[PDB]
Amino acid sequence: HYGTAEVNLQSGNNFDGSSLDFLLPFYDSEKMLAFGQVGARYIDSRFTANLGAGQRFFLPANMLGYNVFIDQDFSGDNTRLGIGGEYWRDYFKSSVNGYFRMSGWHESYNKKDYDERPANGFDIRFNGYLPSYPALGAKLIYEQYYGDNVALFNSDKLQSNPGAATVGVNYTPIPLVTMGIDYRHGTGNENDLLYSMQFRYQFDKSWSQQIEPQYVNELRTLSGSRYDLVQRNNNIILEYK
Ligand SMILES: CCCCCC/C=C\CCCCCCCC(=O)OC[C@@H](O)CO
Numbered sequence: 001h002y003g004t005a006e007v008n009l010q011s012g013n014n015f016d017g018s019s020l021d022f023l024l025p026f027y028d029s030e031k032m033l034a035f036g037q038v039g040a041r042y043i044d045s046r047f048t049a050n051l052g053a054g055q056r057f058f059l060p061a062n063m064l065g066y067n068v069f070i071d072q073d074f075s076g077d078n079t080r081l082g083i084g085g086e087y088w089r090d091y092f093k094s095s096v097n098g099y100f101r102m103s104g105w106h107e108s109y110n111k112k113d114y115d116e117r118p119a120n121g122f123d124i125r126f127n128g129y130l131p132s133y134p135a136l137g138a139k140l141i142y143e144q145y146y147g148d149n150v151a152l153f154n155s156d157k158l159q160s161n162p163g164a165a166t167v168g169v170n171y172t173p174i175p176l177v178t179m180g181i182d183y184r185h186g187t188g189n190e191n192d193l194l195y196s197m198q199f200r201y202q203f204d205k206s207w208s209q210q211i212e213p214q215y216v217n218e219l220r221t222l223s224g225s226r227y228d229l230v231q232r233n234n235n236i237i238l239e240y241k
Pocket residue numbers: 009010011012016017018136169170171179180181195196197
């Protein structure tokens with residue numbers, strides 16, 4: 001069996017919490033992978049679950065992929081459609097994600113005297129790894145959301161059509177674990193930091209393979225990276241009214 005289970009722990013401000021996500025192949029060939037993705041998370045005092053599917057198509061030197069998602073913030077009863085695109089290479093992953101709401105305004109879960117609903121937006125994600133030393137990765141994100149009063153950073157400081165850029169580094173001593181730090185900056189001079197740790201289990205790998213720095217290189221190759229989780233924000237950014 002092939003696929004991935006990933007636990008994520010993150011802190012350090014507004015989106016503190018944890019999550020579990022699975023990538024489950026249902027068709028698997030050298031040239032094309034079709035997969036379901038499913039998971040849930042408790043982050044920023046909300047319980048959210050996510051369900052998706054996509055295809056990945058491979059050439060020896062690159063990969064094209066698309067995916068579709070439904071995101072359900074159960075705490076606040078907010079629903080959203082997600083679409084994604086992927087272009088991956090050795091030591092390089094690029095992704096673009098659209099975020100489209102499916103649920104209307106209604107009494108807000110966390111903010112008194114407000115209504116809330118998902119804010120539409122997109123983001124572009126880059127992840128790159130040093131080929132000579134692939135345990136070192138960096139992380140570029142640009143994200144943009146729309147609405148008169150959106151909470152991209154927190155709900156106590158609402159913002160008009162906020163955008164933000166994130167730079168982060170991360171370290172993967174053995175395939176099983178990644179640690180990193182993300183700095184983000186936007187709109188109103190808003191800043192933050194996210195410290196996070198991922199535990200990665202690979203269904204196709206023996207145990208010893210997953211605790212040996214030898215194999216980090218290969219997780220970061222294109223054929224390495226075939227069962228990695230889709231790269232998106234699985235948290236629904238909300239807007240208020
Ligand atoms: C290139 C070097 C990379 C630098 C890495 C920096 C080193 C370590 C970062 C690890 C951060 C761990 C975060 C803890 C998880 C957490 O607290 O969340 C759980 C949640 O329930 C609490 O809210």
